[model samples]
Every structure is written in structure tokens, then in C-alpha cells.
Target: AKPERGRFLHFHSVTFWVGNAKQAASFYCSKMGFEPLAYRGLETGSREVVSHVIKQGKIVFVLSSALNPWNKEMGDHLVKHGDGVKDIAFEVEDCDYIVQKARERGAKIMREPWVEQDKFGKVKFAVLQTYGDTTHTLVEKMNYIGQFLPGYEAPAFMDPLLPKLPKCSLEMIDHIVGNQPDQEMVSASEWYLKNLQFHRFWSVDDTQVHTEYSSLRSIVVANYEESIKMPINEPAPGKKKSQIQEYVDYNGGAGVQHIALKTEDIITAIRHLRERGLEFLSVPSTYYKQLREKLKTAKIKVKENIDALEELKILVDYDEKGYLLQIFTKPVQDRPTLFLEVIQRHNHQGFGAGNFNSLFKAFEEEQNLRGNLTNM
Candidate 1:
């Protein structure tokens, strides 16, 4: 175990810098089952940035856009990344100590430690740069009583269907993934280990996660309690350019690859998401055939119906103690950058290492269909 620099109370929120805050909020509210929680904009006296906050279970997402034309920070990001994750925020125990410690470890301080207050109690926060263009913001809000941060208020607007829809099965963020250029994965992992007091939770080389056509290397690092896990990936030589390389090429540089959201019932979640027009990567029927045989020798009992699992195209991974179910959605945006993963863990802490090859093959097949695997 690694010595801790500061405690992460929980995942506070994921902030996105998008082209349109209102539309992004509506997309999640309708398609992903998040309820609109708070707002900050011209109407709320925020002059430069407009934001809409939404929540489901313990997960919070703040969609923000520039209110003025001269805001180069948000403008440049939107032009480059095409509306993607900007910050992964955390609830922390001590903001100053962590910021100071990170500075001592040679982190780039994006924002010095500061306090924000309103009618509610004060909340302390600071930001540090992480792997390319993304940041980890530490927020200490034990004394706060407002709806969200100080500038936000309960949304005056409402979604009528929001109340009638079945609750989203997503529980919390399982882990966030970052895609790095070839040979950059280890350096990103070391960044977390040195600056944030994170330790390697698990890792796999290309040999373990490769398919015939594409491959990637990954290292999962986490805080002391193992609550916040971030898996960094880089491309490896394959028969063609790997998926990690594809993401870096399209995203303009290294950026968020996907967010894995934990779900209690993946079956119901997939059915609802698909009904709402979300598309997912598909595996061949032969994969399920092999899965049936693997289950016979596997010790863990899977409570999910195999037939239903096959129908949903959900991948399964098991060990001596338990199994996990997971499925990946196709890229959420047109650029094929950031996607979402719905995962259900049954006493298993491992990422779906067993399904990596099958999942990569499926991904390669899609890349082939799109003519993206050529000229590599």
C-alpha cells in the first residue's frame, strides 16, 4: 500500500466543456436518465460561463459553455476536442495540504487553493493539471450547504418525462479511462503515483489485452481507499493501428477515452439506453458460445440469464470468487472519442481483463467497417 497524501472523500463531479450547455444537459436528462439539478448563467449573474448541473444516484455532471465570445479557454477546447471531459473533481478532506503536496511533487498548479462562499457555508477548492488538457480538481466542501457549488441554484426548468421514467440503473463512476499516445501510458501512471498518492491497482500489457488486429497496454491506478480508479492506456504495435492510437488521432491529442459507470442491473440499463437510441459495440454469437463452455468450468455462479446476456451483447468476466458484467457504448460524439461503459460487479474488483481480446476484436471489426484500419 502507498502512503496517502490526502483523502478522497468521494467523486464529487465530472465537468464537461461543451459547445452548448443547455443541449448537453437535455441529452443526459432524456437519454441517460439524469435529473437536472442546478444552473448558473446570465440569469444567475454568471457573466463568462454558463453551466447546467445534472445528477443521478451519486453521480454529478456539470455541463459548461462560454457565455462570451472572447473566452479563449473554453473556445479553444471546444475547437480541439469537440465537447469532452475537462475535469474530474473529487471531494477531499484537506485542500491546502493536498495542493501544497502536489506542488512539492512538481505538479502544474492550474488554480491556487481558494474558498467560495454564499448563503451556504464556504467550500475550498484547487486544481492541478493531469494528463494532457485534463485536470483533477480537489474540492473540500464539508461545510457547504448550497445546492451545488456557490454559484449554482436549483434549476427553474423541469423535464416532464423525467419524473415518469424508470430510474437509471447507474450507481456511480466505476473508473475513468485516459488514452495516451504510444509509450506514454507508464508516464501518466507515474504522474498519479508521484503527485496524487495513487498506487497501481492492476495492469495488463499488450500481450494480455491484444487481439489479432489491435492492442493496447493499460495500468489502473487508484487512491488509498481504492474508490477513485483511473486506467491509462497507450497504443501498441498490432497488425494495424490500435484503438488507442485512433482515439489520440481523432481527439487531436491525448484525452478521455471513456467513463465506466457502475450499474446495479446492466440488463435493464442496456434495454432502456438502447430504447432511448443509444448504440453499443456488438460481439459475435460465437463469443457467447465460448462463454457458455467457459462457464461450465468457472467456479463463480452467474445470477444473470445467459440468454439475456447474449441478447444485450454484454461481456462477462469471472474468477474463483465472482464475476462482472460490462458493456460499452459506441462513441457518444461524431468524432469517435468519448464513450460510456456500464459495469456491474459481483464481488469482483478487477476490470474486465478476460473480455479484453473479444472486446478488441469487436472494436476492430467496427473500425474495419468504417475504413479506419487502413493505411496504418
Candidate 2:
């Protein structure tokens, strides 16, 4: 068994590399009910790039962009992947040991153990390459007594209309999924087990998560305490190209696909998110019709009103022990690569595996609307 040192504590935050950090940051504020959390730019002495941090509850997103065309790396990423997650940051225990161990286990250290300081204190960080251009940033912030990491300060400005908006109460990062090309899920899953001391927390195969035209296999890796989960997925052969294939094609490679944010009150969350003009994928009434029939003799009774869930186009999946209510947002950007999931679990450890086929069919219809999938 692995020791406690170098252990991943929980999800620290997710950083997105986009073409325009300020506007992307603004959309998150106006649409998802997040508020400006931190900032770093020319004013903060960060001359090369600008980062706008947004927060709601404990979930945080750092939107970053290059300051000029001189930064080839950021420009190339934007060209290849558009706006997508560049790094999934984890709050860990021993920063140096994690890097050293990952180093010894065939992991490429993008950034060696480094420290940054500010008025609050110092925070340690290191970067390791993950699937495709995606990276996992190990952050050790035990010494820092601040709202965010050391390289950030209070937000430069606040939204005046924010106070009038409906509350979008997203609580935690439930999981972040990476969409790999066909047959790459196994290797990506193994990388976490080997390099990060992670374990397989849950999984599903094509047979269990397939639609008529598309199927997918997923393996979920979790940290020591099973607190932080990352679901790595790859496409399976089907009559038509899978959505995973489409995402990889558009993203230009394997990358972070979507983030599932957990909230206690999914009903209120979905209602408020819709009120803010956030778009979600819709499902047909037959789904609810079939679900109403299935729940007649299920082991556990769902407490939420099914009609309320159906009104929001939210989906539900269950086991004898408990259940989960979840809904997916359409791709957040022009490219159909990355999206968001709002999930509420009631004593359930599942990731709504039961909803995949319906979601697949729904999104396939969405793909049809986008004219990306021709029914060949």
C-alpha cells in the first residue's frame, strides 16, 4: 500500500487555456453563477499571461490566456483544441515526493517542484503531463493561508448584475472525464494507477454504455481516499462514429472532455442555470415514461419529484442503495469538445452510468442538429 505522503487530498481547481480569458471568464460568471475569485496579469506582475479565477461554493476554474502572439505554446494549444481544460489541479500532501515518485514511475515532469510566494504565504506546485495536451498539476498549499494560490490576488472587478441573478449553487468537483481516441482508455487508466498511486474506483464497458450508433468504455481512477475521481474514456466501434470520436476529432487529440459539478439541490441548480440562459441537452418524454414504469418496484424510492426533474430535462439513475440526479450542458464553446455536468448524489457512489445510452442518443440527435454526423 502507498504511504500517506504525496497523497492527493482533493480537487484543487481546474485551469482552462482559452483564446480570450477575460470573456470566457465573464461567461462563467454570468451563466454559471460563478463569481470572480482571483486575478493575475500585468497589474499583478505576471507579464506573459493573464488568469481570471472564478469560484462558486468550493469549485474553482482558472481561465488563462497568453498575453500576445509571442507565446507559441498557448497559441498552438488554442489552435489545436480551442478552449479546453489544460490542467486539472489536485491539492496534495507532499509535493516533492509526489513528483519524485511520478518521475521514477515513467511520468514526464512538465514542471519540477516549484514554490511561489505572496502576502498570504507560499504554495508548492508541479506539473506532470497526462492524456494528450492535458496535464495534472500537483499543488501543496499547506503553508499558504489564502483564498486561492499564491500567484493570485482579489478580483479586479465584480459583476454589478450578479446580485440580481438566480443562485447557481455548485458545491464540488465530482469528477473530470478525459475523452481518448479508440482503444486508448486502458493505457490512460493504467497511467494513473502506475504514476499517481490511484486505484480503479468504478468502470463500465461498451456493452453497458452503448447506443445503437455509438458505444464507449470508461475506467474511473480515484485517489487514495476515493475523494478525487477521474474517468478516462475511449470510443468503441459502432454503426456510426461515437461522440467520443467526434470530440477527439474536433479537439485535435485526446483531452479533458467534461467536468461534473456536484450540488445538493439539483432542482434549484438546474432551474437557476436555465434562468441564466445556460443551454442543456434535452430528452424525449418516453424516457420519463419508461422511468416511471421502472420505479414502481425499485428497492429505494427517489424523494425528488420526478415531474420536477423531467421539467428540467434532468436524468436519473439508481441502484438498490441510492441514486443520482444529473443533467448535461451542451458544449460550452463553438467546438463540441468540452461541456459541464450538474450532478446530485443521494448516498450514491455511481456516476450515472445508467444514463449513458440515453445521453448518447440525445447527443447524437444534437450532432445531427449540428450537421456533424451524417446518417450514412
Candidate 3:
């Protein structure tokens, strides 16, 4: 057993539903500077689903089953749920062992243990459910010699666009936040604990997360190595209602709300994301004045200028080690449900607690406009 710490345990491949899988995969490969990895569909043994794999360094994504006949179930899921994460495959030492453990915990099995051997390479894998419509596949590839799991053929490109993405300073995924429905957070957190060899790492109730009129509750889960952290969130009562309720209502159900990507240098990463046409929620100008006042009282040395961070609406928090900075991007999709968070740890292992007021304040404005923030 390993002690929990703030670090990336491994990279999990996530799939997205686009109008067209082939077009979407190609666009990401070209724009995000990802290399075309592997492809499986009718050409392979898969009857209903076609999958395209792309890789950017250690980050991987599998764009698949864009409402096609071959994958009717997957297609229908997209129709019901819209574009969101479908799979979260973990990189582990042994697939059979992990699958067996999950089975012992009474987990619903998706697929039995299977091995695939092809001209490219040989690999073994299995799948199980973790949360609503989300899956965790155990990927064991000790002897595989292919860009992806075996049996996937290398796709050819007739006219590949040259990728022009900015260099990624964010090294890896630090943790993933899973948003669940009202009062379901504790149950979902325990599910991970019982099935995935995870344990409770931290938790925050309404008292810690409330902002005068609204409250949110959360519990953090960690694996044996503390490499993967899953924070489950739910809405709590306050003056009116909580933003978690708003997200669940707008998203139409429970799913991923945001992805917290880790960076060693947040200022540069956020600056580049904006240059790439990303929009962020702006903090009120008054909040910038408050930041100036608060930090002036503290003795921490922030190398970055306060006015610069204010101009960017980026939030920074300090701890005993140093200060951690982060900023949230606007929803990556049209639904205004899912977003991206850029996080940089300056020797601090905790999330930026001090930024919640400004962050949630911006979120509240969106909620009021969406008509979800009703008066009590």
C-alpha cells in the first residue's frame, strides 16, 4: 500500500462525442498537436462502434461512435446525454487483478477479461462502471508493441494539417472532479472506495464551502498511491440554492463538470490558452481591489504582479510552502456545463481555497442568467 499524495497516478483515456468522430479526431490532432495513434471500427471486429485514438505526449483521447448504426447503444447514449466523457480507462500494472478486485466488491461488469493480438502488437484489457454512464477500463500492456491496444490499424491521412498548438507546460492530469446529483455525493464516493481500492482523502461540508446565500459539499477520494484524486460534489441549501444544482439542471444529469489540468507555470499556460481563443469568467473589478488589500496584509512573496493576475482574472492562493495559482476557462462546449481549470502548484499540494469567493461569484452570475438561481 502506498500513502496518498498530490500527484498524477496515471493518464486515463477519455472519449468525446462529436458530430463526426473522424472529423473531430483529426481536428484535435491538428489543433492540439496530437499524433494519430490507432483506429478501430468496422475494419476491426467492433460491429457498432468506431474509435479513433489520438495522443499528445502522455494525454490520450478516444473519439468514437458518433450516433452510428454499428454502435447503437453508444450512439443513443450520446443522444440522451450530449457530449461528455464516456470512458476513464486507468493505466495499471495488472488488468485481471483489478477486474477481479472490482468483481469482489459487487461491481457491475461491462466486459469479461479479453486479450487481443494483432500484426501490430498484443495487449489485454477489461472494463467496469464507476459512475453514471462513465466507465473505468483496466489497461494492461506489458508486452504490447503498438501505438494503442492491439488489433487497431494505423489510420492513413491524405491531407493532415500541420499542428500549431502551443507547447504544453502543464505536465499531466493532477486529479479529476466528478459531479453527481443532489445528496448522491457520499454514495458515489463510497462506490469508488469499495470498488477501486480508494479511500477518503478529504471532505468539505456546507460550512466550509458556503458563500452567504448558497452552499456546496464535497468529498475527495484517493487511490493507493494518492496519484488519482476524485472529488465528488453536491448542492447544499443556503439562501436560495447551490451552483451544483444549477450544473445538474443545465447538464440534464450528473457527469463531469470540469477537468483540472496541472501546470508548473500557470501564467504562461493560461496566457497561451487565451491566445488559442479560450474565454474565461471575469472577476469583478472590485474583487481585484480586495485582492490588493488582502495580500498587502500577508507577508508572502508572489513573483507575479497582482495587477497582472487581476487583469487576467486568474486566482492565486498561498500556503506554507508557496502560493498556488489557477484560473477557470469558460465551458468548452455550447451547453455551458463543462469547463477547464488550469492549476499550478508552487509547492502547495492543496486546492486553491481562497479563490472560491471570486470563482463562485462569477459562477453565480451565470446561474442567475440561466434562471437557475431563484429567489427564496
Candidate 4:
């Protein structure tokens, strides 16, 4: 069956379980330029946990607490994952029907039918697992009782960094990349394909792609309308070592690799993110100059500041329609997990195959700096 148009509203909210919910929420809103939309804490009549919802256009993040004993499971998760994603919510038309459909197909039910109500309306929701430990929540709200889900109130903190928010003006989430062990990529992709009916969109093996140093095999799967695409990667033989293996070893198995957020103005977004404390892999001056001249050779237009992109170590690529500029950040967490990418496309619909070589080489440099890049 085809997934209904806008069926899963494209990652509605990525919930994070945290020990220090208030502080963590503040950090995201303040430093990351998210505006606090709603919150519920002990002072707000919550005894066991507190939660804060922040928004940046379509992206919604729910930060919840587990400092108390009642939230031991969530507390333990935070201690282990260091404030990582919990549930990737998907907006559905009918929560009950989806739950029943998934259950009939052997889906493990994390949560049964539940209702959350607010003054604006009531929401019906359910939860199920994806590959590994990742899970998704099916949400439906026929009642327009509130702006956020139940048990959450508007955050008290004002000046939550609304105007200064980075522009991820890109319309929709193109895809999310995940990394797996040597042979598990296929299984994970199959799980989504078989169960969720996802289709293989595009892919590249290590042979077609290589760095002067390392390489990895990747397969991208997408839904019928291409609303949700996930690129699963595995380590492949390389001259030295592969970054895929490093991520798998550190991540303790299959997990999200990096989130490539799309944008209309990547140059400005990249610049703002840097000013706000986001760190990216730095491509040396030589790489940019070489890549710029290479783009000329390929006949791709240089619409943005090539010099700035090179200085920031950003990468560029193009197809028949137009060109795209993108950049990758080094891992933001202690466990070498969960980096970010900012991408801008001026009509190009394809991923940057040429840009990957230069981008990965720079990534290898960063990995080497951290003493993780090694010979396989």
C-alpha cells in the first residue's frame, strides 16, 4: 500500500531524554537558536518528569526529564546515550488504525493507544520500534485543543532566540543517514523496505566511491513519494580504515550517522551555525581551489562564495538542473556520534558524489586529529 501523501509528516518531533531537562532545553533554545514553545516541570504540577518543546520552523524537539527515580528507564538511557534521540514521531491520519495495522504485522508495541489532551484539543498516539533501538510514535490529533501535546505548557523563558534562529529554509527533510556494521546495512534497509514498503532510490558501493584514504558502501531507501529516505552505510575495504566502522564501534551498533538538514541559503546558515558554536570539518585551502577549478571543468556554476565555502571546507556538486553546496560537521558528542550537515540546492536533485571524496578526505583529517582514523 502506498503511504498516504504527507502520511508521516516527516519527523514531526525528535524527543530526547535527558537528566537535566531544563538545562538541556535551555542550551538548545539558547545556543542552537530554537524557540521554546511549551514546557511542563515540577513547578508546573509535574511530579516525576519535566519537558520542553522547542521549534525552528517545521523542526520540533521535545526535551524531557528523568532526574527522579520514577523516570529511571529514561534516566538510564540519558546516562548511556548522553542526551540522544528517543522517539522519532510521525504525524499520522489515524493512530488507532496504524497501530492495529502494524500490530497485525508483528510489530512490537511500545505503547498502546493513548490520549493526551490540552485546552486546544486532544491527541491520540501510539509507538512502535524500527531497526535496532530506534522507535517511532504515531500521532493523530482531530481535536485542536493545544499547540503542543498533553502534559506540556508554554515555556516561561522569553527571548528564546527566535529571530536569531538559523535558516533551514530548505522545504523538507530530504533524508537521514544511518551507519551500521559491516553486513547489517542490508538487513536494516530490508526491514524498512519489507515492513514499511520503502523503495531503494539510489546507492553507491565503495568501488565506485573512494578517498585517497578510506571509503564506505551506502544504500539509500525512500518511500513512494520520497518523503522519508534513509541512507544506510557499511564499512568497506579502504587503503587505511573506514569511518563507517569507527561510527559503528563507537555507536555500539547501528545508529543515526548524521542529519543532513536542507537549506535555501547554506552559506549563510553555515556561517550562522559556526557563530553559534557548531564545528565542521575544515577543508584545507588547496582542496577548495582544486574543487572550484574542477567544478569549472565540470561546467557547474559558481553562484555562491566559493572562497568562503573553501575556507569553511564546504563541498559543492551539480547535475543537469543546477548546483548544490553542502558541508559536514565533526561529531558533536563525546562518543563520536551524531554530526550535522547543511545543504543548499539550486535545482539539483542528486546527492554530491564528487563532493564526497573531498568531504570524506577532510573528515578523515578530523578523525585523524581525534586519533580514530586508522588502517583497517
Candidate 5:
């Protein structure tokens, strides 16, 4: 009974459902420095949907859109969530073991354990519903020698200007954060705890991570290896509307908020992203001044150039042992949901808690610009 608990290998890929898969892939590849990986569409005989895969390091995103008008579900999803994460795919040791466990635990099984095969190899996969319309796909690759799944073929073309750009050099997914409605965080995170066997890695309350006008709560759950982390967050009652609630309202339901990607060199990564024209929030000079003083009091030494970080508007958080440098992009789409975090960690595990106040403050600044930051 306890032989193999379907240990999750790593994040296989994240699929985004959009109205324009090709253009969505263009934005990701051009701005985020991702390269085209594979494709499946009209040419490949995919009648209902067209999917484009992009990659940087181990991160693979499948940007998929309906090819015709008959796909009512995808069409409705587009109208509801706009462009957002649809399925978070995980590579696991055994899909039968884990997917069955999840089904036993009352997890809605979207698909029973199924196998797909081609000349490359065979893969066992299943789907389960998560918070809102977000779903998780468990893929157990038996011997997938192909670069991507079976239906995908090499992309027809690569970006013309990718060679001219500086290196973003992302390595792997650091974490994926999901936002939930108030009082929903517990049930959502606990689902992972009981079903997927994820352990609670960290927790922060409104008391610790909040600004003058807004507050939120989060509980991070991770597999035993700690390589895969999902932080489930919800809004806390505050003087003004919380950003979590804002996302729920605009995104049309609880959904993926932001994904943190690991990079060896955040400075150059950010520089390249900036040159690629990706907009990020600005941390005021006052925060940097306070950061300098805060480091002095904490008896800490940060290796990255503070001036450069300040120039790029990247935020830093640290404790006694080590530090981390991170920056959040403004929403990748117009709906104010689904952003990206470029982060570099040096012997530290916290998710930029030291910068939470400033991060939320920056969030509020943008919320006000959208005319959504209001007194509650």
C-alpha cells in the first residue's frame, strides 16, 4: 500500500487557454525570452484546437486556442478568464497510483487514467479539477523520447530576433501561486495536503504581509522534494479592497495569479526582459533607502549590486542566513491576472516576505490606476 505514492517528478508544462494561441506565444517568446518548442494545429490535423509550445530552460507553456466555433467550453472559458493558466501539468512516477488516490479523496477526476502513444513512446496521464476552472494534469512518462508530446511537431518557424536579445537564462519553475476567494484558501491548500501529500512549507497571515490599505493570507504547499511549490492565497478583511479579491472579480473566479521562475542571474534576466519591453512595477527610492538601513541592522551582506537591483526596480528579501532578489511583472495580459516573477535565491527559502509590504504597496499603486483600489 505504501510502495510508490506517485512522487511528482517536476512540473512538466503549463497550458494556457487563450483566444489567440499564436499571438499569445509570440508575446511570451518575444518578451519573456522563451523559444518556440513545438506545435499542433491545422497542419498537424488538430481539428478543434491549435497549440503552440514555448520553452526556456525546463519551463514549457502550451498556448492553446480553439480553431473553430464548435468548441463551446473553451470559448466560454476565454470569455470568462481571458488569457490565464488552464492546466498545470506535473510529471509523476505513477499516474494510476496518484490519480486514483486523488479520486478517492473526492477530487473531481476530469479524466480517468489514460494512455497516449506514438512512435516516440507512451505516456499515461489524467486530469483533475482544482480551484475554479483551473485543472491539474498528471503525466507519467513511460519512455517519452520525443522533445514534446506525441501530437506536437517541430515549430514551423522560430523568432527572427531571439539571437539579438540578451540572455534571460531561466532554469526552472521556482513556484506557482494561486489566488482564492476569502475563506477558500484553507480547503484549496488542504486538498493538496491530503490528496497530493504536499507538506505545508510556509504560512503568512495578514498581520505579517500587508500594506496600509490591503492584506492577504497564504499557505505554501510543496512536495517532499520541495522543488514544486504552490502558494494558495486569499484576501483578508482590510480597510480597502484586497488584491486577491480584485483578481477573483476580474479573472472571473479563483485562478492562477503568478508563476515564479528561477534564474541564475536575475540582473541580466531583468535587463533582457526590459530590453524586450516587459513592464515591471517600480519600487520607490524610499524603499531602497530603507533597505540599505534594514540590511545594516540585520547584519546582512547581499552579494548582488544593490544599485543595479534598485535601477531595475527588483526587490530583495533576506534573513540572517542568505538573501533572494526578485521582481514581478505587471500582468502579462490586460485583465490584471497571471504575472511572472523572476527570482534568484541564495540559500534562502522564503518568498520575498521582507518585501511583501512594498510588493503589496506596488500592487495597490497599480490597482488604483485600474480604478479598483477602493475603500471597503
Candidate 6:
């Protein structure tokens, strides 16, 4: 039978399990330009855990820490992953039905379907384990109107410096990239297909996307509306360690590699992020020289200026239809586990596969510098 159609509404929020909720939230607000939205902690009578919520346009993040020193659940996760994504939540129409279907499809249920209510309204939600230690949470707002979830309350005060800073114009999460062990990408993609009803949007093999020393295979899965895209990647044999293996080893297991955030204007967004003291991967100038010829020879017209893109170290990729502009930020944490990608799309629906050669070469250079790529 055909899979159920158009069930997910949109991405709700991504939850990060970190050692210090306050500083994690502060980093996003002060550096990434997100505003402090809501919080839950001991002051709110929560004894086991504390959470801080931040927002910028449609993007929302829940930074959580274990309040109890002996709590091994979240504490063990933080210790192992070192401030990585724990949950990727999605807003859906019917929480119960989705959870039931996932259960029937043999998904590991972390939390059964449940509802919470307060003066705001009622929220229905459930949780299922995804690849590695990450999870996918099904959320139904159910007409709730509170600041965030039921337990979270509006912060006692807003950041005094909020209005003084330039706001980041990130609209929504474009897609999330996940790294899996060798030979695991297909099984992971199948899990989404069977349990969550996602279908393959696009895919690429090592033959198409590979560097001299490393390569990977990827399958992009998405819901009916194509709103949520999760690209599963597994390393392919090469002369040296593939980036996927490095990520899996460093992250302690298969996990989220990077998140791509959609922006209306990537040039401006990247410029602002750079001014905010964020660093990005650098591409060689010669790459752009080849790109200009490639675009011209292919007769693909780019909307953004090539000069500005090269100056910003941004990358451009296109198919027969249109092009997309994107840039990858350096890992936000010390472990190189999770990073961010800012993307601006123009009639392009594919993940920048055309740029993978240049992109992975850039990655290989960074890894070699860090002494992670031994066969250099």
C-alpha cells in the first residue's frame, strides 16, 4: 500500500542536550542573534532538568541540561556526544495516529503518545528513536497558545541587548544531514520510509560525490510536502578516512552532522554571521574560476553576484532548472560534531551534490590540518 500522505506540518524545534543550558542558550542569543524566548528551571520547580528556549523567525531550539548531578539519562548523553542534537521534533496533524503507525512499523517508542494541558491549551506529542542517540518527536500543538511547551514559562526578563543587535533573517530549517556507519545509510533511510512514511527525495552514491581521499553515499528522505528533509550518509572506502567515519568516531556513534538553515539572502546572512565572529570553511579561489566557466558553459544563470559569493567563500550549485547559494560554518563545538549550513534556494530542490567535490575537498583540508586525516 502507498504510504500515508502529507502528515507532517513542519519542523517544530530541535533540542540539544548540553552541559550548561544557560551558556548554550546565551551562545545562540549573543552570537547567532536568536532572542531568548522562554525558560524552565529550578525556579519553575523542575528538579530533574532545566531548559532554555530561543527563537529567530521560524527556527526554535531547546537547550537542556541535567539539573540532577546523578541523573544518568541526559548526563550520559551529554558526556558522550558533547553538546549535540538529541531530538528533531516535527509538528504533525495527528500525534496519536502517527505514533501508532510508527509502533506498528517496529519503531522504538521512547515516549508513548501523551498530552499536556495548561491555561494555554493542550499539546499532543510522542517520541521515537532515530539513528544513533537522536530521536524524532511528533508534536501536535492542538491550538496551544503558550510561549512554548507546557512546562516552559516566559523568561523573567528579555535580553537588554536584543534590539541593539542585527537580527538574523533565517526563515526555517531547510534540511538536516545525518552521518551513519559504513553500510548503514540504506537501513537508516529504510527506517524513515517504513516508520515515518518518508520517501526518497534525491540520492547520490560515492561514484558521483567523492574526493581523492574520501567519499560517502547519501539518501535524502522527506515527508509528503517535502518540508522536512533528512539526508542519511555513510562513508565509502577511500585512500584515507572518510569524513563520515571521523564524525561517527568523534560523535561516539552515528549522529547529526550538520543542519542547513534556509535564508532569503545568503550573502547578507553570511556577512552578518561573519561579523558576529563566526568562521566558515574556505574554498580555493581557483574553484570559483572553474565555477564561472562551468556555469557559463552550462548556460545556468546565477542570481547572486559571483564576485560577492567568492568573497564570502560561499558555494553555488545548480541543475538544469535553477541554482542555490550556500555556505557551511565551522563546527559550533570543539568536537567538530555539529555545524550549520546557510542556504538560499531559487527554484532548486536538490541538496548541493554538484558542490560536493569542492565541499569535501575543503573538509579534507581542515581534517588534515587537525591531524584527523592520517593518510594525507
Q: What TM-score would each prediction reach against the true structure? A: 0.97, 0.97, 0.87, 0.88, 0.97, 0.96
In lDDT terms, which candidate is top? 2
Clashes of each: 0, 0, 2, 9, 0, 0
Across 83-148, the per-residue lDDT of candidate 1 in tens digits comes to 899999999998888888889989999999998888888999899999989998999985787768
- Pairs with steric clashes in candidate 1: none
Better structure of 2 and 3 per TM-score: 2
* C-alpha lDDT of residue 37 in model 2: 96
* lDDT value, candidate 5, whole model: 0.89
Error of 2 at 157 (Å): 0.8
Candidate 2 residues lying further than 4 Å off, grouped into runs, are 2-4, 374-376
lDDT of 3 by residue, 1-376 (tens): 5422222247567776645678777655653445777787777676666788877556677888643555567666666566667777777776776677778888888998788787755667788877777777777666766677775677645333444656546566666777889889998899888777788888888777767688788898888767777788888888876888877876677777776778776667667666655678877788768777877766677787777787778887786567777777777666667776777777666665566555766777777777778755
By lDDT, the candidates rank as: 2, 5, 1, 6, 4, 3
Candidate 4 structure quality by residue, lDDT tens digits, 17-84: 76677777776665555677888877789877778888766667788876467566775566556656
CA lDDT of 212 in candidate 3?
Answer: 69
Predictions in order: lDDT: 0.87, 0.90, 0.72, 0.72, 0.89, 0.86
lDDT of 4: 0.72
Tens digit of lDDT per residue, candidate 2, span 24-90? 9999999999999999999999999999999999999999999976699999999899999999999
Task: Score candidate 1 by TM-score against the native.
Answer: 0.97
Give the lowest summed-lDDT range of ten residues in model 5. Answer: 1-10
Task: Supply the TM-score for candidate 2.
Answer: 0.97
| TM-score (C-alpha, index-matched) for candidate 5 | 0.97
- Rate residue 237 of model 4 by lDDT: 86
lDDT of model 1 at residue 114?
A: 90
